Design a protein around this ligand. Structure first.
Ligand SMILES: [Zn+2]
Ligand SMILES: [Zn+2]
Lengths: 124, 289
């Protein structure tokens, strides 16, 4: 609603947007909504970030740009690359976490060798 | 109720050949909206059903497929339709999208502003438009339709296709008549939005030459007559099984040919979805001034 605009405005008033967002939702703030949830056959491999949807039966798949804080808030991406790791791809979120997909992605990292989420699929 | 398991309804030749006055569109289901499975944007269901219907068409699907998507902004600042296209298309397809105001998108290239500011330097393979302007008797509209008609005549590969949203009041004589320059055409109405006069005007496999002489004003009257005659139930049953949703990886060849070389064999391959004619260079689509 106007609350999406609110938290997206807030992360412009800070030098650490990741921390601003997480501290905001951890203090009871409304998570960002209007993320682009896809419909998928839940028969994917289950990796974190993928060129096509890859949700298992325990996951949901989102359009990548819509769950990226930096894309949603039109602010600079932190990556040395400058290129977003999500935009143009799909991001799998554990089904128990769909209430705040952006907060999940800010709080977790795909395995570097394995490409599953650490703690949510990575067996390395 | 087989039709409710289909992605939507396509205008049959039974109504294409009619000869009727333009009437008001009166649909039995009006203001009735469909619940969205899983809290998903309605445009997810609408674009997926459009894609499922295009899966039954002889689309050309080359490597590095060139797709432009107009009217891609929706739901306050996002682009679910573009994400559906990314889910549907080959991983090496290029998606360029565009809308008036800012939005965030999974396209390869996103251009803000009027569609007239989108400068297509080289011909494309597939055009999707959801452009619709919110603004007494129902005459052919102009608006972005002038731009789209010019695009079909100039910036569309032979063998390429278009899917262009129209409604009872948002439509163009000239665009219907350009459907006569494709191997096949229809109007497709998703089951997800079946209570609206919305339809997607589909031109499949552009031939660059008149195959069917169409009276555009008469054909819109036929489209409304069809909608007024045809029960359609809101439904997303077709999305219940997505195991074959992705566009087939056809490897459609891209050839450069002079107009003088386009003979019976080439027209036949174009018309079957087996060939594109356009440049095979690297694509460039920019913003004009
Ligand atoms: Zn991003
Ligand atoms: Zn791992």
């Amino acid at each position: 609603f106007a609350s999406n605009s609110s938290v997206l405005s807030l992360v412009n008033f800070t030098v650490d947007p990741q921390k601003a967002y997480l501290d905001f939702v951890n203090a009871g703030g409304a998570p960002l909504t209007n993320c682009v949830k896809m419909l998928t056959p839940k028969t994917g491999t289950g990796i974190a970030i993928s060129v096509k949807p890859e949700s298992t039966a325990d996951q949901e798949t989102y359009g990548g740009a819509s769950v990226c804080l930096y894309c949603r808030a039109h602010i600079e991406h932190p990556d040395v690359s400058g290129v977003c790791k999500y935009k143009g791809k799909f991001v799998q979120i554990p089904a128990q976490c769909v209430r705040d997909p952006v907060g999940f992605c800010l709080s977790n990292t795909p395995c570097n060798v394995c490409q599953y989420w650490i703690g949510y699929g990575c067996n390395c | 109720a087989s039709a409710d398991w289909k992605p939507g309804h396509a205008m049959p030749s039974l109504f294409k050949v009619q000869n009727v006055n333009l009437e008001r569109c009166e649909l039995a289901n009006y203001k009735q909206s469909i619940p969205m499975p899983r809290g998903v944007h309605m445009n997810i269901a609408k674009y997926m059903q459009l894609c499922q219907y295009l899966n039954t068409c002889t689309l050309a699907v080359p490597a590095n497929m060139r797709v432009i998507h107009f009217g891609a902004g929706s739901d306050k600042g996002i682009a679910p339709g573009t994400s559906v296209l990314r889910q549907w298309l080959p991983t090496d397809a290029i998606i360029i999208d565009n809308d008036l105001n800012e939005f965030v998108s999974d396209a390869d290239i996103t251009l803000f502003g009027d569609c007239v500011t989108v400068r297509v330097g080289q011909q494309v393979d597939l055009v999707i438009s959801d452009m619709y302007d919110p603004t007494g008797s129902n005459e052919s509209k102009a608006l972005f339709f002038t731009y789209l008609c010019n695009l079909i005549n100039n910036n569309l590969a032979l063998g390429g296709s278009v899917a262009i949203k129209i409604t009872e009041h948002s439509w163009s004589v000239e665009l219907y008549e350009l459907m006569g320059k494709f191997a096949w055409w229809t109007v497709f109405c998703t089951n997800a939005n079946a209570s609206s006069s919305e339809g997607f005007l589909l031109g499949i496999n552009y031939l660059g030459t008149i195959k069917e002489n169409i009276d555009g004003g008469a054909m819109h009257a036929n489209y409304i007559f069809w909608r007024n005659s045809t029960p359609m139930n809101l439904s997303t049953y077709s999305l219940f099984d997505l195991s074959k949703f992705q566009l087939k990886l056809k490897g459609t060849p891209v050839l450069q040919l002079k107009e003088s070389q386009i003979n019976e064999l080439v027209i036949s391959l174009l018309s079957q979805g087996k060939l594109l004619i356009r440049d095979n260079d690297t694509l460039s689509v920019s913003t004009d001034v």
